[PDB]
Amino acid sequence: KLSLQDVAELIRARACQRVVVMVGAGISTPSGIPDFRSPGSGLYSNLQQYDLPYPEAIFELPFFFHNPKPFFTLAKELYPGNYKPNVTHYFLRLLHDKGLLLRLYTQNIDGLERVSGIPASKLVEAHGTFASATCTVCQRPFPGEDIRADVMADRVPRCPVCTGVVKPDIVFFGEPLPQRFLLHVVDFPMADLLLILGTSLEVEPFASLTEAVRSSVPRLLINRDLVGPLAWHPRSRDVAQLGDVVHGVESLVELLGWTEEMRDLVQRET
């Protein structure tokens, strides 16, 4: 059984030099963006105002074509620009500064990973981004910023060529995975450490990427709960730090001896 302390030692020793990271919506709850499924505050449990057939419909395409307003209203509330990265993001940014980060796979659309200053080449935005948009009819692409004013003004963005609804390049249920997701085949066999933070590991194939690392590779889960292959297909070098993601990240940072470097980092960036 490995401990959090053993992981920290591996990193300090550079026995782990190619960290791959998987994150989800739990890493952004501390920044004021709800996750999908936590009781009370989870997105799926507060969508009454939108009078949907069921909660998941607000991120499905066929509902979107029937009525795009509910999604765009929610998207106004979620639109990037003023939310800030938290310590979870800055710790990942610190892995990259210290040359330890192979790749950061994210399910979030909030953009906070980039905002924390991790360069785009190290990121795989597995569920897309607000940075670009696409006409849902004629497939003409647009910079995402060209729909921001419409969104902020409660209007449905329309294509100036064809008048079709223009949608940010967020991956809706059952839409195609983006092309950068295809990097998983190259990254996962090279990982020598896997960190998973703030995700329920419910969606496939994303969740399965946890099994795609070599079985000798330690998998460290920082999350409220024990989830996915860490719960159902455990391996002998798995470590779980359960509880608040920020407290978990801080504990790790302390064992690593990075407390003052983080403080200094979070100061400069903020």
Ligand X SMILES: NC(=O)c1ccc[n+]([C@@H]2O[C@H](COP(=O)([O-])OP(=O)(O)OC[C@H]3O[C@@H](n4cnc5c(N)ncnc54)[C@H](O)[C@@H]3O)[C@@H](O)[C@H]2O)c1
Ligand Y SMILES: NC(=O)[C@H]1CCCc2c1[nH]c1ccc(Cl)cc21
Active site residues: 127
* DSSP bridge pairs for 132: 143
29 has binding-site annotation: yes
Number of residues that bind Cl ion (CB under 5 A): 3
Contact flags string 89-118 toward ligand X, x per CB under 6 A = ------------------x-----------
* Shortest spacing between CB 142 and Cl ion, in angstroms: 38
Query: Which one of the spans 31-39, 132-140, 169-177, 206-214 is the region binding Na ion (CB under 5 A)?
Result: 206-214
The answer to the question of residue 22 lying near Na ion (CB under 5 A) is no
Of the two residues 137 and 156, which places its CB atom closer to Zn ion in the complex? 137
Is 225 known to sit in a ligand binding site?
yes
In the complex, minimum distance from the CB of residue 188 to Cl ion, in angstroms, rounded to a whole number: 16
User: How many residues make up the chain in this entry?
Assistant: 270
Site for ligand X in 190-249 (CB under 6 A): 198-200, 202-203, 223-225, 227, 244-245
Joined tokens for residue 7: 């992981």
Work out what residue 86 binds among Zn ion, Na ion, ligand Y, none; the CB cut-off runs from 5 to 8 Å by kind: none
Considering the complex, state which of residue 114 and residue 237 has its C-beta at the smaller distance from Na ion. 237
The phi and psi torsions of 126 (rounded to 5 degrees) equal: -70, -25
Q: d(Cα 141, Cα 20) in Å, to the nearest integer? A: 30
Q: Has 164 been labeled as part of a binding site? A: no
* Of residues 74, 65, 223, the one with CA closest to residue 151: 74
Amino acid at 257: G
Query: What is the distance between the alpha carbons of residues 108 and 198, in angstroms, rounded to a whole number?
Result: 10
**C-alpha span between 183 and 71 (Å, rounded):** 29
User: Which residues, numbered 47-86, are part of the site for ligand X (CB under 6 A)?
Assistant: 56, 59
Dist. CA 239–CA 211, nearest whole Å: 14
Q: How far is the CB of 184 from Na ion (least distance, A)?
A: 13
**3-state DSSP call for residue 206?**
coil
What is the Cα–Cα distance from 91 to 85, expressed in whole angstroms? Answer: 10
In degrees to the nearest 10, what's the CA dihedral of 103, 106, 111, 116? Answer: -40
Q: Which residues are annotated as a binding site for Zn(2+)?
A: 135, 138, 159, 162
* Interface residues toward ligand X, by CB under 6 A: 24-26, 29-30, 35-38, 56, 59, 107, 127, 171-173, 198-200, 202-203, 223-225, 227, 244-245
